[PDB]
Amino acid sequence: DVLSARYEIVDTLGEGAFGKVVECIDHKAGGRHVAVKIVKNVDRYCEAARSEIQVLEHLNTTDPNSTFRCVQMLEWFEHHGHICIVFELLGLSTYDFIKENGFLPFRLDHIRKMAYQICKSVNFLHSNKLTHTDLKPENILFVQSDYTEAYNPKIKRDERTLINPDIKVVDFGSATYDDEHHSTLVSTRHYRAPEVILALGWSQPCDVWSIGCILIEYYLGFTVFPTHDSKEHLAMMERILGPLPKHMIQKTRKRKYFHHDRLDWDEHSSAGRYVSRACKPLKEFMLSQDVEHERLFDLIQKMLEYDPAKRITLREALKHPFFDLLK
């Protein structure tokens, strides 16, 4: 298939509820390939795609050189009733890279620069009265996914090391302005903030919670929330972070999760023993007591503050000691 008389599909990069993203040759322009998002002809996804186009048009006007590392939209059009958005071609997602590495975690120096760029990008959105709402490693993509495969003696396996860890943030179809309607449920479950789970209302801080989850995943290679159930997810939080704040518990209407304004959770049920084996207090996940591991986990703990009003902002996160070896 050849959209818009110039774009020949050569590969499908990824597929989702919205449609797919394909890699295309541009037969009119010089031959650097592009990424093309082809949106399903369903109202739900059409409307998100038009919102994405509006957001990216305004971000391109404010930040035409992508200083703040949002993916660059090159053009958009309609084709057989599908909205098609042409993007600069990026490399693998940060999730794809970890997975293809056998779920080996990223090196701390790479985590530092990736976290910085992520916080920079999302803080730019937040500066602009926008919340992303769907931050996850799948929506953080490497500008170039080239690697060197080195022998790692510890322990005895070949491992892939990023040549350049620069990223960009993608997927603005769920992004929500301060004054716009806020969806009831946002984010992918493992990155979803507690105020979303408890239906208390959400704003920019829910992005910070997701980034905190992303950072631990980069550090560990796996999610600390291996769950597909909301009450179990809350039990995992309490295992990692301590009890939920009482003020959040009495404000929620999610009464099925609570007994006497405490989480209705049997730690000695079968699911309770699953949680106890999969999760543990946050700092027990640290693999070193070195000061820069300590500052990463201090940053993560501040991003995983339960109360969205007390959670660190990305403006404050950007000044965190963890990022010093970058400056």
Ligand SMILES: C[C@@H](c1ccc(F)cc1)n1nnc2cnc3ccc(-c4ccc5ocnc5c4)cc3c21
């Ligand atoms: C997880 C992600 C994604 C989807 C497909 C894919 F191949 C890679 C990433 N994703 N999930 N939901 C959405 C919505 N809109 C988008 C718009 C663009 C891109 C995007 C942009 C440039 C790319 O360069 C290479 N893959 C890319 C994907 C991804 C998305 C997108």
